[PDB]
Structure 1
Amino acid sequence: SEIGRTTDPVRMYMREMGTVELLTREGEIDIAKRIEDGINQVQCSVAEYPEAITYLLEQYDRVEAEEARLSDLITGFVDIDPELAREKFAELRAQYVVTRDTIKHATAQEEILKLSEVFKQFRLVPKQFDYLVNSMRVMMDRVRTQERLIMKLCVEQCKMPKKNFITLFTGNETSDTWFNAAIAMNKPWSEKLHDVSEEVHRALQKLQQIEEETGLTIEQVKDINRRMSIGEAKARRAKKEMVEANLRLVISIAKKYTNRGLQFLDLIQEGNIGLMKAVDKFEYRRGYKFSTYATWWIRQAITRSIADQARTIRIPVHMIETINKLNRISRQMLQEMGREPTPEELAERMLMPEDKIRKVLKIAKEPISMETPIGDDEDSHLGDFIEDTTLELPLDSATTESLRAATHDVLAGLTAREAKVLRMRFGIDMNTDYTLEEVGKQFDVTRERIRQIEAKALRKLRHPSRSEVLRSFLDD
């Protein structure tokens, strides 16, 4: 084969991509119905968990109080009109009535799949179902962490293949009555498990608490969890077939954006993200072909990606739209009048102020590379003509050290008290400067007196006796 002959990742993408055959009009229908069957059966699988039923019904009474809108509660009902939802959620309430107490445990096992297939006709939205499935994932984490507590609370104490201890556990679910025959092996594992037989205490009951707050047994809600996993992997399997089949559409779209700032593969990967968004946001009951929907989503994803990550100094998407409108308008104006339009006529073909056009035109430039050769001279570049402006000139460093010396001497020519007042009030020889109150607490003297001391020393140093060297530190 062609494996190992190329190094271009574009060619490897096209090679791995062309090995998936396209879909017909009816193939997309079949795949979308597989997706829909997976997602509504997994929504029935979380409907097997009746705390979700309680949540549905309490937000249904909040819908009767209109906490949020019905469109992002329900998308409709299969065989928006709100009067279906009210009375047929009341119907589900009567169904919950006939299942709440009709257990008197062999006769209750029909009303639950009757609940499922009367829940069949329900549609659910993504976000509140995301709340429901995060609650279900809390349920999952609790189930798995308790079963793994059972797993590695005993095997960190013992050395034995634990299938002998799982054979007695499944079905008990209430107490340690399955521990009475653990020691009967009399091989030292259940001897060491003696020292564990107590500290499982507040574990082994507490899950069994919520077991009947959600009504159903821990083993059969583990069955519900695995059936949920089967249904959700069934949905995600068919979401994979629809993406991998329409991967040519992403390339056919993304070839129109090629030199607009991103690489080819970056464009097709952002379009792939858009295509996955189109797939999990596509519903086939509108009777429209999937490509016309995925094209909108892929165009959105690719243009948003170019707006976000194609520039070094990133400008927002609104300024990107503004610059694109500006370039289009100036393009048409150049075509109609044969010259580049002035910003004071480009601003009147648009309706923005002229200074806004000026700042937009100042913004739209991309940074030069510092390895740009100057006049095609390769040994030189742009990078070695750019100086460091933040540096200090060593003449200014010498000026600063000389000013430090001169100031130190002309303040050594004073009384130590007032010279330290000046060194203390400015930041001289000290990490911080101090206001008059600070030094008032320090010098044991009221504020305005040491203010007058500072003025005293300043008037003293203004004389041309000592200030002849300092004046040369002033500019001309």
Structure 2
Amino acid sequence: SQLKLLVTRGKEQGYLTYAEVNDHLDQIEDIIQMINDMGIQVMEEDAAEAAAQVLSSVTTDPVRMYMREMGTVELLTREGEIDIAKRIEDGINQVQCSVAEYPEAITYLLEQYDRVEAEEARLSDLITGFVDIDPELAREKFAELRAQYVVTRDTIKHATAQEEILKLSEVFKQFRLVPKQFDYLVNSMRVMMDRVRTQERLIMKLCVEQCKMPKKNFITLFTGNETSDTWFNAAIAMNKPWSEKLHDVSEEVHRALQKLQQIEEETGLTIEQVKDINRRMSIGEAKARRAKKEMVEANLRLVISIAKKYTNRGLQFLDLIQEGNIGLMKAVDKFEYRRGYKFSTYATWWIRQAITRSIADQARTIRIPVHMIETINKLNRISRQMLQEMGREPTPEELAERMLMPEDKIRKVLKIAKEPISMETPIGDDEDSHLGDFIEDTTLELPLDSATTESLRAATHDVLAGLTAREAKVLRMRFGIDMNTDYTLEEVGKQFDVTRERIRQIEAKALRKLRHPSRSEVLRSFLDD
């Protein structure tokens, strides 16, 4: 009963300073704030049992928690990093072969290649170069995959076809196409399996997961034939009571066979080929991704070092680090040891631009262009070596001759900086009046000026009372009076049915009668020169 004793002491004495709470036991700050409201009135020189129970249970600074997270992280070895890199490469090669394991993947490849041969893109933008100068080689090489395919079409009738679809894949592996074309068939390959797997959710889940169908009966039926009705539409003579329940969906999951034969057609070959193709892909792919995840772990020590110097330019320290990580992971996709290098020197390029491209983006309440922040950081630095050099200070004219800019393109940037003041700033007087307590309004109608205008629509109503029905109505017509209004002069020509020209005559007649001194002197009151 240590802290239980100290809280007993708090209920005894009723005020406990840092001496006890430091010597009766960060978590220090946390526990003092908790002991505040037994209530105890702690100081520095349903809660009593509630706070007692929370003080009976024995840091959350996310920086401390982040160090503790990183505790099981350690610098990775150089050629070990090469090993992780080659593992990533093996994963990307698994994914490449997987897409080349899909023949119609290469078919859509030829589709895009023809569209760029029909000029639907750029001959150097169809791919990020082959793994080898002039496109007619790589293009004819793509054309080789064209002919290398139609030589493959002769042989699904299977011994000579399987190693012919791959020869256009082994050539495929020696290429490097742009990721958008890469991810399209991939994200179509991602679409391919969701379509087929969803079918078995219509195929199998509507048998194995509803009709009390044991796992053996579908797997012992489906996988082995896997395409026709011999595995599904033959199960309804299983001598079973649940295979008897295979009738109500027999025309429905047979549709799911109508969708699979589409998918076998859509895949061009058996779905189990396509299955272990993209199964193999994401099998290595996750491992491939797993390889990248491993490497990013052992480089955050760089990023905490990088961000150690950008900190106090108005950005939260855990905000610098997260932007730091974003570059560190983006480079894992881009760093290549294929030259033979250390990732350490490569990373800080990306991680520097990460912090700084962000620091100029989301580090003020008024945002500014990086090319303007390009300017301000160029002045403030060039301000240094001129203030330190010339003597007193760089006048904006003096900056005009260091930087030959017009000095009214400069001086506007020197008006740009100095982000707004905290309106909760405490003003003097020791009165606790904040700054915002004196910033007045400009939207308010001056209470007198409202009081004025209420007579205006009254007073103009006065003279407009003693008008003719035409002039009184036409002026309310002509001007924006007592309605959603201001109908144009042609518009008043229509409603009053007189003339676009005649209206201005009576309109001219209108105030010409109202231009009488000693007749409309009321609005003469609303004049002050």
TM-score, scaled to structure 1 = 0.90
Contact 1:424 1:433 (C-alpha < 8 Å) held by counterparts:
yes
Label 1:9 to 1:349 Cα distance change in 2 as closer, same or farther (>3 A).
same
Label 1:161 to 1:448 Cα distance change in 2 as closer, same or farther (>3 A).
farther
Task: Tell me by how many angstroms 1:77 deviates.
Answer: 5.9
The alignment's C-alpha RMSD in Å is 3.1
Contact 1:424 1:430 (C-alpha < 8 Å) held by counterparts:
no
Task: Tell me by how many angstroms 1:440 deviates.
Answer: 2.1
24-33 vs 155-164, greater mean Cα deviation? 155-164
Contact 2:208 2:218 (C-alpha < 8 Å) held by counterparts:
no
| Cα distance in 1 between the residues matched to 2:111 and 2:237 | 50
| Cα distance in 1 between the residues matched to 2:74 and 2:429 | 50
- Count how many residue pairs are aligned between Structure 1 and Structure 2: 474
122-131 vs 192-201, greater mean Cα deviation? 192-201
342-351 vs 163-172, greater mean Cα deviation? 163-172
For residues 97-136 of structure 1, what are the alpha-carbon distances to aligned partners after superposition, in whole Å with 9 as ceiling and x for unaligned? 4432233435544445555555443444423212231222
Label 1:289 to 1:362 Cα distance change in 2 as closer, same or farther (>3 A).
same
141-150 vs 176-185, greater mean Cα deviation? 176-185
Contact 1:45 1:228 (C-alpha < 8 Å) held by counterparts:
yes
70-79 vs 357-366, greater mean Cα deviation? 70-79
Label 1:79 to 1:393 Cα distance change in 2 as closer, same or farther (>3 A).
closer
| Cα distance in 1 between the residues matched to 2:501 and 2:79 | 93
Label 1:171 to 1:400 Cα distance change in 2 as closer, same or farther (>3 A).
farther
Contact 1:143 1:222 (C-alpha < 8 Å) held by counterparts:
no
For residues 416-461 of structure 1, what are the alpha-carbon distances to aligned partners after superposition, in whole Å with 9 as ceiling and x for unaligned? 2221111122121111211122222212222222222222221111
Contact 1:374 1:381 (C-alpha < 8 Å) held by counterparts:
yes
Task: Tell me by how many angstroms 1:212 deviates.
Answer: 3.6
TM-score, scaled to structure 2 = 0.81
Task: Tell me by how many angstroms 1:210 deviates.
Answer: 5.0
316-325 vs 213-222, greater mean Cα deviation? 213-222
Label 1:62 to 1:414 Cα distance change in 2 as closer, same or farther (>3 A).
closer
Label 1:426 to 1:164 Cα distance change in 2 as closer, same or farther (>3 A).
farther
For residues 357-399 of structure 1, what are the alpha-carbon distances to aligned partners after superposition, in whole Å with 9 as ceiling and x for unaligned? 1111011121101011123846111110101111111101111
230-239 vs 216-225, greater mean Cα deviation? 216-225
| Cα distance in 1 between the residues matched to 2:426 and 2:111 | 70
Larger RCO: Structure 1 or Structure 2 (Cα < 8 Å, ≥ 6 residues apart)? 1
1:367 equivalent in alignment to 2:367: no
Find the partner of 2:460 among 382, 389, 407.
407
Unaligned runs of 5+ in 1: none
Identity fraction in percent: 100
| Cα distance in 2 between the residues matched to 1:354 and 1:271 | 36
| Cα distance in 2 between the residues matched to 1:213 and 1:324 | 58
Task: Tell me by how many angstroms 1:261 deviates.
Answer: 1.9
Contact 2:95 2:285 (C-alpha < 8 Å) held by counterparts:
yes
419-428 vs 244-253, greater mean Cα deviation? 419-428
For residues 257-286 of structure 1, what are the alpha-carbon distances to aligned partners after superposition, in whole Å with 9 as ceiling and x for unaligned? 011121111111001000111111111112
| Cα distance in 1 between the residues matched to 2:388 and 2:139 | 60
Contact 2:307 2:355 (C-alpha < 8 Å) held by counterparts:
yes
| Cα distance in 1 between the residues matched to 2:501 and 2:128 | 77
Q: Secondary structure of the equivalent of 1:355?
A: coil
| Cα distance in 2 between the residues matched to 1:138 and 1:242 | 29
Match of 1:98 in 2: 151
Contact 2:200 2:256 (C-alpha < 8 Å) held by counterparts:
no
Unaligned runs of 5+ in 2: 1-55
Find the partner of 1:262 among 315, 330, 342.
315
Label 1:163 to 1:395 Cα distance change in 2 as closer, same or farther (>3 A).
farther
Label 1:256 to 1:439 Cα distance change in 2 as closer, same or farther (>3 A).
same
370-379 vs 400-409, greater mean Cα deviation? 370-379
Task: Tell me by how many angstroms 1:161 deviates.
Answer: 5.5
| Cα distance in 1 between the residues matched to 2:253 and 2:517 | 92
Match of 2:206 in 1: 153
153-162 vs 164-173, greater mean Cα deviation? 153-162
| Cα distance in 1 between the residues matched to 2:431 and 2:211 | 73
Contact 2:360 2:373 (C-alpha < 8 Å) held by counterparts:
yes
Q: Secondary structure of the equivalent of 1:439?
A: helix
Q: Secondary structure of the equivalent of 1:128?
A: helix
